[PDB]
A paper describes a structure:
Cypoviruses, members of the family Reoviridae, subfamily Spinareovirus, possess a single capsid layer with turrets and are commonly embedded in crystalline occlusion bodies called polyhedra, which are formed in the cell cytoplasm and mainly composed of a single virus-encoded protein, polyhedrin. To ensure the delivery of virus particles to the target intestinal cells, allowing the transmission of packages of infectious virus between hosts by oral-faecal routes, polyhedra are disrupted only when they are exposed to the very alkaline pH environment found in insect midguts. The fold of all the polyhedrins is highly similar – a β-barrel core sitting on a base domain, surrounded by a common array of five helices (H1–H5). The strongest intermolecular interactions define a trimer composed of a cluster of three β-barrels sandwiched by helices top and bottom.
CPV4 features long V1 and V5, which loop back to interact. All polyhedra belong to the same I23 space group and the native crystals (at 100 K) mostly possess a unit cell of 102–103 Å (102.8 ± 0.4 Å). The exceptions were CPV4, which forms crystals with 2 distinct unit cell dimensions (101.7 and 104.8 Å – the structure of the larger unit cell is an outlier and is discussed below), and CPV17 which has larger cell dimensions (106.1 Å room temperature and 104.9 Å 100 K). Native crystals of CPV4 polyhedra grouped into two distinct unit cell dimensions, 101.7 (±0.27) Å and 104.8 (±0.18) Å, whilst all SeMet crystals had the larger size. Crystals with both unit cell dimensions were observed on each of several frozen meshes suggesting that this was not an artefact of sample preparation. Thus in CPV4, the purines are replaced by greatly elongated V1 and V5 regions, whilst the shortened V4 loop would no longer be able to contact the ATP. CPV4 has limited numbers of molecular interactions in this area, while in CPV5 a few strong trimer-trimer interactions are present. In CPV1, 14, 15, 17, 18 and 20 solvent molecules can move between these two voids, whereas in CPV4, 5 and 19 they are blocked by tyrosine residues.
Numbering used by the authors:
A (entry chain A), B (entry chain A), C (entry chain A): 2 to 254
């Protein structure tokens, strides 16, 4: 880093020390249990556009995105292009029930090339997980040997550190994949907030608030990430946004 | 109240006392834990029409309604008016990602002026809550200082008492708001049904059953409320429906 | 059954005994807690087509399907046929708010005649339940006397045994019905995985993965069932698919 001489007032510089306190509040308020956490799944489309599934939640997040939800210009598990009563054009059916569909092309170009998953806040980094599952949301072809997570679940340092508050990972997808994501609040020290008398609040306060937002180009995705103070990895593989606050920003450039 | 002379049969008037018992059953059966509770969010539209998000649930309710779900004539987070691939007409995008959208008008007239939230049953009135959050479902502009609820969450006597079984509140909205609602079953005396061996049932039995119903005019909303036995506040600010049962109805008019 | 003479190698027939072990793994891996379970609701339409709500989940499943979700060619609670701003054509409204709608026919032929519900895996068979509820998801006309389940909830041996791993039931529906389904993991012996320190995982790992798949004819439904290794009852009332694995298939035909 590049730093050099600086001056400040003496004991009377409470304005500066107050701003230092504020910087620390922004950086540690997320660790007060039942503070919000934020997880965003950014689908990267062939078209150069992107779509964010943006979740804010205070305790835990259980996400499954199926094939149609992942498509460009959908906002739910509903595809306006594809009237399911028509005999032709059933690409989704052809993928989830092999050789019983009728898509007009091998690769529906609305299906994403991959997702950037951004985890932010007081997350339990040891159990934060992503999986590219098959069409059914399974991590084994045979459900009878599938489990909550697969033997090679995406986790640990596959989630790139982006600051004390954030990690992000890029997950390539092929056309038969779906996406699962898990994040929970960090263990509350030696107390388990999912245990005993603490559970009711942890469970019932957990209103997950999802939004699906589209972006016409990555510049706009990156702007969204800096607006929302969340980690993001751009097309160049660089970490261009973070949840960590610095009192003078990137002043040691 | 207006009451006057009445007669009844003597010890043989079991029909009357049976009906008195039935009145009490309707009024107290909701307090038997794992009985249904009922919460309804009525969106009031500029058009004079309304839309109800009607939830019945036996243990707890965690609701977040985002911008598109709140729009007149939507039934999910999907807006048929707005094809998200078009460059023009992205009003939702303009609100949730400031100055990256293209709505055709400053105020999409399908967005509601406010909601009437109706809580009914054995609800924990001390932790029944509503918030008009921002587009992301946050109660602070900066998620890093946002929490499960805001410092000024709508609660307590902002929820108007409408009988022993019900409360209702009117919540004005501006166009960038979304709505969150929490209701849980009242503490089970000194036992916590969210604790220990009671939790499995409390958790897994809690199938929340949502319906989205539209009403062309308030007369029809009020009818729906009386059909469903739930509190409702009409345009005049009057409580015109309740969950409380009376053996002769409003006979002391 | 028809069986007759067979031979095998002696102590060196490890290939056979390995395949016997594999058969047993497929049959008992589902009993390792947090293994996947699979529940499918197959709607049978007047048109001879079917639609599957296919859920895989590791711990519990809480399903409510409302009227519009049940309709042929819907994939969410959204009906493209019916623009809710139009005065005519509101069949759903006419059912859920009696005599306030305007459907074009008494019976919307997209509404199913019944559902086949298929339960598979380490399910608690004593508390696996289905209900055909009314439009609101209630099992009593008056919610104040409704409960999490009705006095005549569909359960026990109404769920037909289809093997050690599976049961299935046919549930007739009339046009004002909706469908509720509950399945949970079997009690973990004398330990309760929904209790104490076990709960956090049981709760947060439970990502339910739903897909809605259509089938143009029952032959294709039956194929889907055999692909997915789940119980299914065909139009003839026969059990034509199962989760149970046999080392030589149905070799005692």
């Amino acid at each position: 880093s590049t730093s050099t001489y600086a001056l400040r007032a003496g004991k009377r510089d409470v304005r500066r020390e107050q701003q230092e306190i504020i910087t620390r509040q922004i950086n540690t308020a997320p660790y007060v249990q039942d503070a919000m956490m934020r997880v965003v799944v950014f689908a990267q489309y062939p078209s150069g556009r992107y779509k964010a599934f943006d979740y804010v939640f205070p305790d835990y997040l259980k996400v499954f995105l199926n094939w149609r939800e992942l498509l460009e210009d959908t906002t739910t598990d509903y595809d306006p292009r594809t009237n399911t009563h028509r005999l032709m054009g059933q690409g989704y059916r052809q993928l989830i029930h092999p050789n019983h569909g009728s898509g007009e092309e091998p690769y529906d170009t609305r299906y994403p090339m991959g997702v950037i998953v951004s985890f932010n806040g007081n997350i339990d980094w040891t159990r934060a997980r992503v999986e590219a599952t098959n069409m059914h949301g399974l991590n084994n072809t045979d459900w009878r040997e599938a489990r909550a997570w697969g033997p090679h679940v995406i986790c640990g340092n596959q989630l790139r550190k982006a600051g004390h508050l954030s990690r992000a990972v890029y997950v390539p997808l092929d056309e038969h994949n779906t996406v699962k994501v898990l994040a929970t609040a960090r263990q509350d020290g030696a107390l388990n907030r999912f245990n005993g008398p603490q559970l009711a609040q942890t469970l019932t306060n957990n209103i997950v608030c999802p939004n699906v937002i589209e972006f016409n180009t990555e510049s706009d995705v990156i702007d969204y990430a800096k607006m929302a103070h969340i980690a993001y990895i751009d097309q160049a593989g660089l970490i261009v946004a973070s949840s960590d606050a610095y009192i003078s920003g990137d002043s040691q450039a």
